[PDB]
Amino acid sequence: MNPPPPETSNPNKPKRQTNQLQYLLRVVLKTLWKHQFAWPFQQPVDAVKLNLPDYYKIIKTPMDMGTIKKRLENNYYWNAQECIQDFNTMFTNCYIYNKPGDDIVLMAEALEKLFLQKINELPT
Numbered sequence: 001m002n003p004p005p006p007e008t009s010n011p012n013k014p015k016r017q018t019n020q021l022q023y024l025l026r027v028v029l030k031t032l033w034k035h036q037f038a039w040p041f042q043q044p045v046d047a048v049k050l051n052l053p054d055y056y057k058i059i060k061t062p063m064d065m066g067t068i069k070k071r072l073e074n075n076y077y078w079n080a081q082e083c084i085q086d087f088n089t090m091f092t093n094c095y096i097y098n099k100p101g102d103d104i105v106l107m108a109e110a111l112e113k114l115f116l117q118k119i120n121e122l123p124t
């Protein structure tokens with residue numbers, strides 16, 4: 001069975017909006033979303049649908065771009081670094097669950113390179 005997806009709101013967590021977080025939604029996330037390899041990453045891994053009964057037996061900090069998008073829309077994050085950490089968790093989860101050379105890993109590697117390209121320079 002699937003675990004609950006990561007929270008996208010939390011009333012006792014303080015919220016914040018910054019220029020860098022606005023950019024992370026408007027430019028970084030919304031650009032990566034349109035990439036031809038983004039589709040595996042647009043929603044939480046559904047282990048029942050995808051027939052990955054070991055996924056959440058291996059991956060204990062799940063993350064995906066649909067969750068990140070909702071978090072950005074809700075001003076869930078305190079700063080850009082917190083959001084960037086969720087992207088990095090999403091990519092590393094893929095590398096951990098799989099192995100080098102797998103099609104899904106080739107997709108994550110390409111997306112990670114584009115992500116790094118986009119966050120290399122952030123607004124002030």
Ligand SMILES: COc1cc(C(=O)NCCc2cccs2)cc(OC)c1OC
Binds near residue numbers: 045
């Ligand atoms: C989001 O992370 C993952 C997503 C998928 C996924 O959508 N699989 C559907 C068919 C595919 C297989 C190869 C390319 S896409 C598979 C993974 O591992 C098999 C992942 O990593 C855990």
